[PDB]
Amino acid sequence: HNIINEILVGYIKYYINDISEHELSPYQQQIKKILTYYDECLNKQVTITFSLTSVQEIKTQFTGVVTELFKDLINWGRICGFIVFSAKMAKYCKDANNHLESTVITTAYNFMKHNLLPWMISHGGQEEFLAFSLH
Amino acid sequence: SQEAVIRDIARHLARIGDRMEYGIRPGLVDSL
């Protein structure tokens, strides 16, 4: 419940401005560097926009993107993308004030647990995602 | 096309992630 909080949830809440920069754990503050670098890397190529109105569209559209992202390969690089995208859908809900940011975070949380977390653990877990952030 | 939109978003997330995950340098090498 904290390997997902420190790798995923924490960065989202920081992105949503729900939570300040030094509210993040030391671990979180290190890995945020690669996530930010990712976010700006992605912005440079594509502008993503959302039209979500309810909980229902969140579940299908999010699962659409993230499943397709891990249809073929899983790697820590695609994990950054998962986190970043999760944060940008969540920020849309923030800005739109439809009060569904918590749904996005829940949805991402559950997906990471049921589909990715067994692979993460199988591949060096928290420490490895840290190592990746430094490279 | 809504599904296509979903697929392109996922195409960008994948390739940006993979270039990071692997050592993937740009193709163009300008040599003086």
From Swiss-Prot, chain B:
Entry-annotated residues carrying Phosphoserine: 1
Residue interval(s) of motif BH3: 9-23
Name under which the protein is recorded: BH3-interacting domain death agonist p13
Compartment(s) of residence: Mitochondrion membrane
Shown residues in whole-protein numbering: 75 to 106 of 192
Superkingdom of this protein's organism: Eukaryota
Gene, per the UniProt record: BID
Transmembrane segments annotated in the record for this chain: none
Residues the record marks as site: Cleavage: 21-22
